[PDB]
Amino acid sequence: KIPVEADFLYAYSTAPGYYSWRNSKDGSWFIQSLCAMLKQYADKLEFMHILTRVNRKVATEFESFSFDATFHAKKQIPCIVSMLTKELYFYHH
Amino acid sequence: LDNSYKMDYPEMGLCIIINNKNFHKSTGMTSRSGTDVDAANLRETFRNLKYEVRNKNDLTREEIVELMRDVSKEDHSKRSSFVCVLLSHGEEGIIFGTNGPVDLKKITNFFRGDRCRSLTGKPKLFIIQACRGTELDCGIET
Amino acid sequence: VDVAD
Numbered sequence: 647k648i649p650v651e652a653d654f655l656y657a658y659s660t661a662p663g664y665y666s667w668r669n670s671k672d673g674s675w676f677i678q679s680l681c682a683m684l685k686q687y688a689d690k691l692e693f694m695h696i697l698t699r700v701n702r703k704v705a706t707e708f709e710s711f712s713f714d715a716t717f718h719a720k721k722q723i724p725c726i727v728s729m730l731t732k733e734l735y736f737y738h739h
Numbered sequence: 740l741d742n743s744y745k746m747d748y749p750e751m752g753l754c755i756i757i758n759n760k761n762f763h764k765s766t767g768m769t770s771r772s773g774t775d776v777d778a779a780n781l782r783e784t785f786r787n788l789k790y791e792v793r794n795k796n797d798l799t800r801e802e803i804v805e806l807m808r809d810v811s812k813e814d815h816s817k818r819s820s821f822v823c824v825l826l827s828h829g830e831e832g833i834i835f836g837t838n839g840p841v842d843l844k845k846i847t848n849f850f851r852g853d854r855c856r857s858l859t860g861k862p863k864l865f866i867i868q869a870c871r872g873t874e875l876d877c878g879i880e881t
Numbered sequence: 882v883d884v885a886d
Contacts, residue, residue: 648860650852651742659886663831663872666886672885673776674868677826683783688788709878710883721878733743733781733885734820734862736751736788772884828886870886 648731655734656695656727659704667710667722675722679703693734722725745819752818753860754790756781759827762837768828777868779852781824790822800836802834804845811849815857821850822864825869829869843867 650709658668659676663692668674687688701724758778762768782792795806807823815821823846828835832843852859 648852650854652852653860653862654847654850655862656847658871660871660884661869661876664870664874664876665872666779666829666868668771668773668868668872669883670772670885671776673773673780674826675883676868677777677780677824677866680866681780681845682782685787712882712884714843717875717883719877721876723876730744730862731860731861732741734741735746737749858885868886 652731654729655693657700658725658727659722660725661725664722665720667708667720675704675708676700676724682692687735688736693736694726695729697724700724701726713720740860749817750819751789752791752815752820752822753810753813754781754785754788754792754822754824755792755806756792756824757803757806757826758794758796759798759807759835759837761833766837766839768835768837771826771828771860774826777870778824785822787811797837799838801838803834803836803841807846807849811855811858813857815855815861816868818858819860819862821855821858822866824866824868826868828858829867829871831871834867834869839874842875 712718760774761772
């Protein structure tokens with residue numbers, strides 16, 4: 647038998663307890679970087695390897711921009727939460 | 740079993756995108772501008788991934804629960820995985836329907852091993868674009 | 882501009 651909570655993967659836009667940013671014109675930093683990396687590496691990289699490059703993207707390529715000084719120049723790091731028991735590839739054999 | 744999940748099933752599976760942009764003003768939540776680009780980005784990205792995508796827009800918290808009860812009470816037997824994409828306002832463990840909060844554990848528990856047996860040993864992914872608090876990461880320099 | 886969720 648297997649546990650009832652295995653093979654769950656939770657991709658979070660932001661670290662636990664933090665703000666998650668989104669651009670008013672382009673869209674959220676996370677879904678932005680996730681779609682770029684999924685479109686670019688789903689042929690060749692394991693899923694957790696795709697999801698870490700998404701982390702490097704949101705962490706480094708992005709920074710907030712606001713007229714409110716309170717919400718300006720803020721960073722964001724995603725958070726992978728894997729209860730998976732095997733690796734995940736979107737290509738076959 | 741294998742070193743990797745079996746993905747050579749008939750279907751890759753269901754990809755449910757839940758895109759709440761407009762919220763009732765009784766909540767104090769504001770229009771989520773730019774989410775249409777995200778949801779439309781996700782539909783295409785998983786359309787190339789051979790997923791059966793289903794975009795669902797401005798769903799109330801009760802409509803989010805009952806949809807996931809219907810999705811979990813499906814015969815996923817022919818599907819490799821289940822993807823779920825939530826795009827809304829958020830707290831820690833809390834996702835927002837357009838009229839109030841849901842618990843992230845409410846939604847996910849519909850798909851557990853003993854509840855969604857068509858999806859047992861099958862990768863269940865959950866992508867959550869939502870705040871988890873109100874702490875500001877200001878960064879640091881290298 | 883960028884906004885918090």
